[PDB]
């Protein structure tokens, strides 16, 4: 019923600017309170700001004050975070959240999915996708997503119909400066041949959508 | 400004155990504290508000205590699904500062990894690179060793490890290691081996192939 959906995230040159959007569904913004919070990949949670949609009053953390502005358009039911003059430190997953209905307290009970902001002077690159074919009980197979930037990459198996034994590994930053991961899944040996296995890789930054079929080799 | 110092940074506990997490404010916050449960790659979920008030639909094994300066989240009977990072937050007044976090991992019976190796695809060799992957599946504890041997030589600084975040149903980990080289360097060797050491193993497990 109630949810936040955030967008606008992606790659940005250091010194540059970006605008994030938090779209609210299932409740009216006027009279509610909206918070932006970020999480740098390694570390913990950091409160950025607060806006009351009705009247448009705002408050910020010292670490972003003057550089960042929160606003909201009550008529489109969407809040915004405008970020200027970005730094490597600003690389993070940004969330918006609504204050809970039940007390003066700044508890946040509904959160968006989160969107990744990456600030660096590097170029967008599409991934290559490679088979990781099985051989010989139970058998393992997968896909290799190689040489992409920036994060993130989305891997699904058979449009999402397969979730048992599916391990998508954290990406690894390589020497070259590109990212790489593997998604893998374990299946019964008897199902080989009669069950097709397709991994569904999506890297929206470069806008690559690739669905590769993994079978054994002659 | 108001500090929130969390304790500890991380902990392991058995299923059924009592877990206690501590947050500490530098100033009197009275009762204005909130706890959040964040599972990896998911948004934080509100557990507690006003120090001791359970948010609706939250399991009863979570409870909150404390006043003024010293605060406690408690899980009475730890469940596998409870793997996550937990956060205290000062909820009044602005700026609302969050604690550093507490990573909670489940302790579990020991399990030896299942090892797999994967030769590079022919279509990758085309573009002049080779990636050989070794998969260790559904094992516990986390600490494991993947050694690459290439024609029986030990390899150094040419592989990268990536670790699955602990499984939330059976509390296991998975690990991938990737050996990367120039197809010229690949095509000058015969046997590609992957050697694995774990607490569940009393003797190293080797998995290998021969180039074509
Ligand atoms: Ca409202
Ligand atoms: Ca308020």
Q: DSSP readout, B142-185? A: S--EEEEEETTEEP-SSEEEEE----TTT--EEEEEEEEEEHHH
Annotate chain A with three-state secondary structure.
CCEEEEECCEEECCCCCEEEEEEEECCCCCCCEEEEEEECCCCCEEEEEEEECCCCEEEECCCCECCEEEEEECCCCEEEEEECCCCHHHCEEEEEEEECCCCCCCCEEEECCCEEEEECCCCCECCEEEEECCCCCEEEEEEEEEEEECCCCEEEEHHHCECCCEEECCCEECCCCCEEEEEEEEEECCCCCCCCEEEEEEECCCCEEEEEEECCCC
Final residue in a domain of this structure, among B93, B108, B123: B108
B58 plus B118 within the same structural domain: no
Pairwise CA distance, residues B171 & B106, whole Å? 6
- For residue A65, what are its two tokens? 């004050």
B87 plus B47 within the same structural domain: yes
B75 plus B117 within the same structural domain: no
B99 plus B142 within the same structural domain: no
Pairwise CA distance, residues B95 & B2, whole Å? 8
A133 plus A57 within the same structural domain: no
A6 plus A84 within the same structural domain: yes
All residues at 6 or more sequence positions from B69 whose CB lies less than 8 Å from its CB, including other chains: B24, B25, B26, B27, B28, B29
Ligand 1 centroid – CA A30 distance (Å): 5
A117 plus A135 within the same structural domain: no
Q: Tell the residue number behind the tokens 């430190």, with chain if given.
A: A89
Q: Does the beta carbon of B27 lie under 8 angstroms from any beta carbon of chain A?
A: no
Classify residue B126 by burial, with Cβ atoms within 10 Å: 0-12, 13-18, 19+: exposed
A74 plus A26 within the same structural domain: yes
Chain B: closest CA distance from residue A17 (Å):
24
Residues B66/B71/B74/B80 CA torsion (nearest 10 deg): 160
Length of chain A as a residue count:
218
Instruction: Report which of A218, A141, A216, A149 is spatially closest to residue A183, judged by C-alpha positions.
Output: A141
CATH classification at residue B64: 2.60.40.10
Q: Are A118 and A151 in contact (CB under 8 A)?
A: yes
A108 plus A160 within the same structural domain: no
Pairwise CA distance, residues B170 & B139, whole Å? 10
Structure determined by? X-ray
The total number of structural domains that make up chain A:
2
Final residue in a domain of this structure, among A100, A121, A142: A121
What is residue B191's three-state secondary structure?
Answer: strand
Structural domain boundaries enclosing B91: 1-108
Cβ contact, residue pair A105, B163, below 8 Å: no
Q: Are B154 and B179 in contact (CB under 8 A)?
A: no
Structural domain boundaries enclosing A131: 122-218
* Strand B70-75, strand B84-90: pairing: unpaired
The total number of structural domains that make up chain B:
2
Final residue in a domain of this structure, among A60, A89, A121: A121
Q: Are A56 and A74 in contact (CB under 8 A)?
A: no
B148 plus B65 within the same structural domain: no
Instruction: Report which of B165, B142, B169 is spatially closest to residue B15, judged by C-alpha positions.
Output: B169
Q: Does the beta carbon of B46 lie under 8 angstroms from any beta carbon of chain A?
A: yes
Cβ contact, residue pair B120, A130, below 8 Å: yes
Q: Are A203 and A126 in contact (CB under 8 A)?
A: yes
Q: Give the containing element (helix H, strand E) for B91.
A: none
- For residue B146, what are its two tokens? 């993947």
B5 plus B59 within the same structural domain: yes
B80 plus B156 within the same structural domain: no
Query: Does residue B10 have a cis bond before it (omega within 30 degrees)?
Result: no
CATH classification at residue A135: 2.60.40.10
- The separation between CA B25 and the C-alpha centre of its own chain, rounded to angstroms, equals 28
Classify residue A192 by burial, with Cβ atoms within 10 Å: 0-12, 13-18, 19+: middle
Pairwise CA distance, residues A190 & A25, whole Å? 46
A141 plus A151 within the same structural domain: yes
Q: Does the beta carbon of B69 lie under 8 angstroms from any beta carbon of chain A?
A: no
A146 plus A196 within the same structural domain: yes
Length of chain B as a residue count:
212
Final residue in a domain of this structure, among B73, B108, B143: B108
Final residue in a domain of this structure, among A121, A149, A178: A121
Classify residue B8 by burial, with Cβ atoms within 10 Å: 0-12, 13-18, 19+: exposed
B205-210 β-sheet, strand order: B153-154, B145-150, B191-197, B205-210
Chain A residues touching residue B46 (CB < 8 angstroms)? 100, 107-109
Pairwise CA distance, residues B210 & B55, whole Å? 58
B13 plus B98 within the same structural domain: yes
């Amino acid at each position: 019923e109630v949810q936040l959906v955030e967008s606008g995230g992606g790659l940005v040159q250091p010194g540059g600017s970006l605008r994030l959007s938090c779209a609210a569904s299932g409740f009216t913004l006027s009279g509610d309170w909206i918070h932006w919070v970020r999480q740098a990949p390694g570390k913990g949670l950091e409160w950025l700001g607060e806006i009351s949609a009705a009247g448009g009053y705002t408050d910020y953390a010292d670490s972003v004050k003057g550089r960042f502005t929160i606003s909201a358009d009550t008529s489109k039911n969407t809040a915004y975070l405008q970020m200027n003059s970005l730094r490597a430190e600003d690389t993070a997953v940004y969330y918006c959240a609504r204050e809970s209905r039940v007390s003066f307290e700044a508890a946040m009970d509904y959160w968006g999915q989160g969107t990744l902001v990456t600030v660096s002077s590097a170029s967008t690159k599409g991934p290559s996708v490679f088979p990781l074919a099985p051989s010989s009980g139970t058998a393992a197979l997968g896909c290799l997503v190689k040489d992409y930037f920036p994060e993130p990459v989305t891997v699904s198996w058979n449009s999402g119909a397969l979730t048992s034994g599916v391990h998508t590994f954290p990406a690894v930053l390589q020497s070259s400066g590109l990212y790489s991961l593997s998604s893998v899944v374990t299946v019964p040996s008897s199902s080989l041949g009669t069950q097709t296995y397709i991994c569904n890789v999506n890297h929206k930054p470069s806008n690559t959508k690739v669905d590769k079929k993994v079978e054994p080799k002659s | 400004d108001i500090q929130m110092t969390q304790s500890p940074s991380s902990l392991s506990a058995s299923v059924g155990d009592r877990v206690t997490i501590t947050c500490r404010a530098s100033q009197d916050l009275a009762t204005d504290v909130a706890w959040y449960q964040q599972k990896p790659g998911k948004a934080p979920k509100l557990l507690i508000y006003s120090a001791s008030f359970l948010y609706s639909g939250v399991p009863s094994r979570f409870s909150g205590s404390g006043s003024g300066t010293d605060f406690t989240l408690t899980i009475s009977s730890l469940q596998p699904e409870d793997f996550a990072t937990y956060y205290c937050q000062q909820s009044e007044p602005e700026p609302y500062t969050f604690g550093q976090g507490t990573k909670v991992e489940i302790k579990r019976t020991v399990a030896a990894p299942s090892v797999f190796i994967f030769p590079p695809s022919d279509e990758q060799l085309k573009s002049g690179t080779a990636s050989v992957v070794c998969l260790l599946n559904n094992f516990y504890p986390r600490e494991a060793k993947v050694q690459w041997k290439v024609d029986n030589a030990l390899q150094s600084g040419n592989s990268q490890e990536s670790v699955t975040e602990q499984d939330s149903k059976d509390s296991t980990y998975s690990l991938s290691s990737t050996l990367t080289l120039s197809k010229a360097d690949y095509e000058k060797h015969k046997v590609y081996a992957c050697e694995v050491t774990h607490q569940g193993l009393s003797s190293p497990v080797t998995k290998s192939f021969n180039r074509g």
